[PDB]
Amino acid sequence: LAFGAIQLDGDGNILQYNAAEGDITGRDPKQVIGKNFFKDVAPCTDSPEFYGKFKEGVASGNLNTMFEYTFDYQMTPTKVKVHMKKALSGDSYWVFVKRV
Ligand SMILES: *C(=O)/C=C\c1ccc(O)cc1
């Protein structure tokens, strides 16, 4: 995956996104990575339950699953498949998204 592969820490901050290796856009780069999630009391960012039991993933100590989620609604995103993996570094977990 040259796109879809993001690595985040098991505390709540994004570390690196695997895709940025060629700045061929003039976007505002405050979209992804460098994300320190402060307790602004915002549990509604399209994910009431974080990813795939991400909240349990952390404390269970084995956040590594591939789960495909189909959106059979109207105003929903495309069918994606999340492969999360507890980073081999330790207290961090990856997120590989892959649309079908
Ligand atoms: C999170 O924001 C959950 C519910 C909700 C309901 C109504 C409005 O306007 C915002 C949010």
Swiss-Prot record:
Superkingdom per UniProt: Bacteria
Membrane-crossing residue ranges in chain numbering: none
rRNA-binding keyword on record: no
Name of the molecule in the record: Photoactive yellow protein
Full-protein interval shown: 26 to 125 of 125
MF terms (GO), sorted A to Z: identical protein binding; photoreceptor activity
Record text on subunit structure and interactions: Monomer.
Family that this chain belongs to: Belongs to the photoactive yellow protein family.
Gene name per UniProt: pyp
PAS domain residues: 1-61
Modified residues (S-(4-hydroxycinnamyl)cysteine): 44
Modification after translation: The 4-hydroxycinnamic acid (p-coumaric acid) chromophore is covalently bound via a thioester linkage.
GO BP field: phototransduction; regulation of DNA-templated transcription
Keywords: Chromophore, Photoreceptor protein, Receptor, Sensory transduction
Source species of the chain: Halorhodospira halophila
Role played: Photoactive blue light protein. Probably functions as a photoreceptor for a negative phototaxis response.
